[PDB]
Amino acid sequence: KIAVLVVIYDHHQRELNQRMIDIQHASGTHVLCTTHIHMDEHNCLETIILQGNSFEIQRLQLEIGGLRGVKFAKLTKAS
Amino acid sequence: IIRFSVSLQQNLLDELDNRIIKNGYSSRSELVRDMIREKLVEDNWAEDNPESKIAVLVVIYDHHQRELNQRMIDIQHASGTHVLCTTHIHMDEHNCLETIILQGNSFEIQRLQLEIGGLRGVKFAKLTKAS
Amino acid sequence: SIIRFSVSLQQNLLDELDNRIIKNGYSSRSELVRDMIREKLVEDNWAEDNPNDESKIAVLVVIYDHHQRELNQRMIDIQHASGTHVLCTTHIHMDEHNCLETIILQGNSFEIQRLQLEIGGLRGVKFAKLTKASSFEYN
Amino acid sequence: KIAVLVVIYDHHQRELNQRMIDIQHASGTHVLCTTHIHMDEHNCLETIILQGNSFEIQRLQLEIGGLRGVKFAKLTKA
Ligand SMILES: [Mg+2]
Ligand code: NI
Ligand code: NI
Ligand code: NI
Ligand code: NI
């Protein structure tokens, strides 16, 4: 399975990027790459693309989805 | 921070519970948090008026399908939506995945998703709406 | 009926949710939320890959113009090549340029949903929407 | 304007049909017709098609949704 996680987060939350990076390096999944754009002055949008088993993918969204300053983390899956 | 009460029929609470397992949520509230956060984006998209909403279109397609990539270019150009960025993954010989960050109004963005998805050689097209 | 239980949640997130109650046409928080969860558990139950599961029930509601040539047959053909089983369809002649159909369908969630997308994309079809029935609701 | 109510209900609940019929005849809406099929040995599925203002339509779903033996009443509007 390949998946894409879309994350919207607070631009002013300090150290949040670091945490998100720690998580993705610790992850059992294979993260192919991430892309970041400013939506505006307050919010960044992030696309994380990944391959792995659905269990390891789910844990990634939960770990990320729970951080403070994360507005949301939405998963899309394909076969 | 803060706790509040909800009333659910029995059969719905059990399914929620079951779903907590199937998906590996730690708590009930973690999954309700998730439902709310996505219900809010959904209600922001349905239904204001004018721009400038953000969405991510995820697309899987076969690059051996002739003209398709240019069909997608043309279709997007005639849409009124603005592409902010696209990432492309060469998955294998016969699959490409694209994430296309789009800005515009909800109607044009959604119409674009249906148009792209209807194209031959397009195996998967899915929108993730943002707010 | 009814089992109360608790949800822990960021303050700001509850306010944002609370400001939906009236706009969505609801009178209380409970009713809004309880419907959100019902709708999400169903979608989630349908967003699940179980390749041979023909027990699922859905109602497809369609509005279209009968003046559009070939369309009705396109719908017949599309449904025939879908693997879904039609149990029944009611048709209302609304006026000169509008027919409404309620099609009761049985099959697996993927084929049923694919059918909704296919019909909805046809020219002359003005409206096509699925009402899903999931088994935790009635079984 | 035009709406469809989908209702799944308990096949073994006695007098429920009557109640559902009383309610639709009493209703402020114009009910065009209803269709019933057995989903299995325990559950019936019912499609009610109606025209009316959203207020009268909403009250129909609530009144039907509230009966005993009714598993659910889901509304679609066009
Ligand atoms: Mg190829
Ligand atoms: Ni910045
Ligand atoms: Ni490629
Ligand atoms: Ni007709
Ligand atoms: Ni019977």
From Swiss-Prot, chain A:
Family from the record: Belongs to the transcriptional regulatory CopG/NikR family.
Protein's name in the database: Putative nickel-responsive regulator
Task: Tell me which Gene Ontology terms the entry assigns under biological process.
Answer: negative regulation of DNA-templated transcription; regulation of DNA-templated transcription; response to nickel cation
As cofactor, the record names:
Ni(2+)
Its biological purpose is as follows: Transcriptional regulator.
Source organism per entry reads: Helicobacter pylori (strain ATCC 700392 / 26695) (Campylobacter pylori)
**Subunit (UniProt):** Homotetramer.
- How is the cofactor bound, as the UniProt entry phrases it? Binds 1 nickel ion per subunit.
Keywords in alphabetical order: DNA-binding, Metal-binding, Nickel, Transcription, Transcription regulation
According to the record, which residues of the full protein are present here?
64 to 142 of 148
Where do the annotations place Ni(2+) binding? 25, 36, 38, 44
A molecular function (GO) held by this record is:
nickel cation binding
Keyword Metal-binding applies:
yes
Q: Which GO terms describe its cellular component?
A: protein-DNA complex
Swiss-Prot record, chain B:
Query: What is the superkingdom listed in this entry's lineage?
Result: Bacteria
Annotated Ni(2+) binding lies at 77, 88, 90, 96
Cofactor(s) demanded: Ni(2+)
Q: How is the cofactor bound?
A: Binds 1 nickel ion per subunit.
Gene Ontology cellular component list: protein-DNA complex
Q: Listed disulfide bonds for this chain? A: none
A Pfam match: RHH_1
Keywords assigned by UniProt, alphabetized? DNA-binding, Metal-binding, Nickel, Transcription, Transcription regulation
The entry lists its GO molecular-function terms as: DNA binding; DNA-binding transcription repressor activity; identical protein binding; nickel cation binding; sequence-specific DNA binding; transcription cis-regulatory region binding
What GO terms describe the biological role, i.e. biological process, of this protein?
Answer: negative regulation of DNA-templated transcription; regulation of DNA-templated transcription; response to nickel cation
Name the HAMAP family for this protein.
NikR
The family database entries (PANTHER family) matched by this protein are listed as:
NICKEL-RESPONSIVE REGULATOR
Q: What does this protein do?
A: Transcriptional regulator.
For this chain, the family text in UniProt reads: Belongs to the transcriptional regulatory CopG/NikR family.
Record text on subunit structure and interactions = Homotetramer.
State the protein's name. Answer: Putative nickel-responsive regulator
